[PDB]
Structure 1
Amino acid sequence: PGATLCLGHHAVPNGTIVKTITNDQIEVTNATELVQNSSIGEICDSPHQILDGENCTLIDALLGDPQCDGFQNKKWDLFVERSKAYSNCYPYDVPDYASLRSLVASSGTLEFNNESFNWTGVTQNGTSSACIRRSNNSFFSRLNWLTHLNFKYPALNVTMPNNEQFDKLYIWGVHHPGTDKDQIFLYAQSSGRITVSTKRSQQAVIPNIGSRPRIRNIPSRISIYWTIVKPGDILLINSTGNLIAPRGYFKIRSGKSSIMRSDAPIGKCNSECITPNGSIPNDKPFQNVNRITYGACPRYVKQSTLKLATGMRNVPE
C-alpha cells in the first residue's frame, strides 16, 4: 500500500507569450505591459498650470497682439500653442525666433513692468490699420512706435538703469518701411539707425527700406530683437529713426516651465505626464505615444509592446 506524494506547480488555461534571452516566444502564466501606448486625448489641466494659447503664439502674447491682451502678465508651467494660431497685428519677423520663444517659454511668465523712457523730441504711440484693437487702429501693446515730431526726428540717446535685484528682458524692434516715401513720412529723414547697448553687449541694426510680399496688405516689416539687462547694468538706446521702442521690461525667471505644440483639448482632470496627444498615465516605465513630453513621464521607446513576465512558465495539462 503506502502513499504517493507529488510536488507540483500551477498552470493557467490562458497563458501569455514573452521574450527571454534564449527564446523569443515562451509562454508564462501572467505578464504585465511596460509600454504605455495610449492617451485619453486631452491635456489634463492639473497638476501643472496650463496656459492655452488659443489663437495666440507665445511670441504674439509677448509682443501684445490685440487678440492676445487677455494673456498679459500670466504665468504657466506649460504654454500650449495651437496649430490654428495666427497673427493679426503689424507683420514682423524675429531673427532667431526659436531662441526667443524658448527663453520666454522656459522663464514661464509674461509679467511686464512699464518704464518711463524719455522720448522727448519724437511722436509716441504710432498706430496702424493692420493692428486693430477695439475697432481702432492700434499697435503691439508692449511696443511704442516712435515717429517724427513737427517733421524732425532728433537723435535719441536714452538710458535705463537696472537697479533691481533681478534681470530685465527687453523686447524692441526696427521698422523697415516699404518705400522711401514712407521712410520720410514717418521719420523725417532718409535713413534710420538703431543701436541698443549695455556694458556687456551691443546690437546695431540698419533698417532695410523696400517692398516685401504684402501680408494682410502690408509690404513693410518690423524685425524684433531682445536684450537682457543684469542688475548694475544699463540699457542704452541710440536711434536716428525706425526704432520700435520697448515700453518696459519682462521679468525673466527660472524654473520648470516649457511650451508644447498640440491641438488636444484641455480637460478638467489630473495627470502628471503631458504629451501633444494628450496626458498619459505614468505607471509604466516606457511609452510609445510621443517623444515629446512634459512632467513625470515614462520614457519614449520605439517598441509598441514589452511584456514583463509576472509568473512562471505555463505548462498546461
Structure 2
Amino acid sequence: VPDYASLRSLVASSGTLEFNNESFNWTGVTQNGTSSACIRRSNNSFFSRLNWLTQLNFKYPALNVTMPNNEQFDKLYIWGVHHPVTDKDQIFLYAQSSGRITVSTKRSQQAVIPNIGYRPRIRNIPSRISIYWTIVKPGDILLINSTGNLI
C-alpha cells in the first residue's frame, strides 16, 4: 500500500466495514480469476472484497465503466493493480503488453502504470498487488478506464 499508514488510519477512523455489492458492466472479461496462492475451502482463491480480471479468448477489450453516487453518503472504493513478472506472464494474464490504469472523480484523479518486475517470492509468489483508495463525494461519477492489470 503506497501511503499504507494513511489508508489504514482512514479505515480505522471509519469504524465500520459494511460493504455493498455492485454489478459493473464487466464484459468480455474472464473474471473470477483464481490462484493457489490464496486458499479457501482447500481451493485456489483470491481476496474476498476484490475481483481479479483476466482476458477471455486471447483477447481483452479495454474497460470503460462508470458508477454514479446518487445517494446521501460517500462511497469508499478499494482497488489494486497486479504486477506481472515476465512479458510471458503479461501476455498470459492480460494479452496486451502495455498496462495502464486511469481512475477519476470530478474533483480529483489518479493513474498508475504497472511496473513489470521480478520480485522476491513471499509464499512462492513472484508478484505483488498495489493498493490505492479513491473517495467519492455524492453527485460524482467514479469512472475507471483500464487496459488490464486492474483489481
Fold conserved between structures, TM > 0.5: yes
Task: Name the structure 1 match of 2:54.
Answer: 147
Match status 1:137 vs 2:44: yes
Residues 105-138 of structure 1, C-alpha deviations (whole Å, 9 max, x = no match): 0100110011111111211111111111111011
Give the distance between the partners of 1:105 and 1:191, measured in 2 at CA. 36
Residue 180 of structure 1, CA deviation = 0.9
Residue 140 of structure 1, CA deviation = 0.5
Q: TM-score, length-normalised on structure 1? A: 0.46
Match status 1:109 vs 2:16: yes
Residues 193-230 of structure 1, C-alpha deviations (whole Å, 9 max, x = no match): 10011111111010111111111001111100110111
Residue 191 of structure 1, CA deviation = 1.4
The structure 1 residue matched to 2:139, chosen from 228, 232, 237, is: 232
Give the distance between the partners of 2:32 and 2:108, measured in 1 at CA. 27
Give the distance between the partners of 1:210 and 1:186, measured in 2 at CA. 14
Give the distance between the partners of 1:233 and 1:139, measured in 2 at CA. 30
Residues 268-308 of structure 1, C-alpha deviations (whole Å, 9 max, x = no match): xxxxxxxxxxxxxxxxxxxxxxxxxxxxxxxxxxxxxxxxx
The structure 2 residue matched to 1:173, chosen from 65, 80, 83, is: 80
Residues 238-287 of structure 1, C-alpha deviations (whole Å, 9 max, x = no match): 00110xxxxxxxxxxxxxxxxxxxxxxxxxxxxxxxxxxxxxxxxxxxxx
1:195 is paired with a residue of what secondary structure? strand
Give the distance between the partners of 1:171 and 1:125, measured in 2 at CA. 17
Give the distance between the partners of 1:117 and 1:167, measured in 2 at CA. 18
Residues 131-170 of structure 1, C-alpha deviations (whole Å, 9 max, x = no match): 1111101100111101101111111110001111000000
Give the distance between the partners of 2:142 and 2:75, measured in 1 at CA. 10
User: Any gaps of 5 or more consecutive residues in structure 2?
Assistant: none
Give the distance between the partners of 1:117 and 1:229, measured in 2 at CA. 17
Give the distance between the partners of 1:119 and 1:200, measured in 2 at CA. 25
The structure 1 residue matched to 2:4, chosen from 87, 97, 107, is: 97
Give the distance between the partners of 2:10 and 2:100, measured in 1 at CA. 27
1:196 is paired with a residue of what secondary structure? strand
Give the distance between the partners of 1:201 and 1:102, measured in 2 at CA. 20
Give the distance between the partners of 1:134 and 1:148, measured in 2 at CA. 25
Structure 1 consecutive aligned stretches of length 4 or more whose deviation exceeds 4 Å:
none
Q: TM-score, length-normalised on structure 2? A: 0.96
Give the distance between the partners of 2:28 and 2:70, measured in 1 at CA. 26
Aligned residues: 149
The structure 2 residue matched to 1:196, chosen from 98, 103, 109, is: 103
Give the distance between the partners of 1:200 and 1:125, measured in 2 at CA. 32
1:204 is paired with a residue of what secondary structure? strand
Higher-Rg structure is 1
Give the distance between the partners of 2:106 and 2:34, measured in 1 at CA. 33
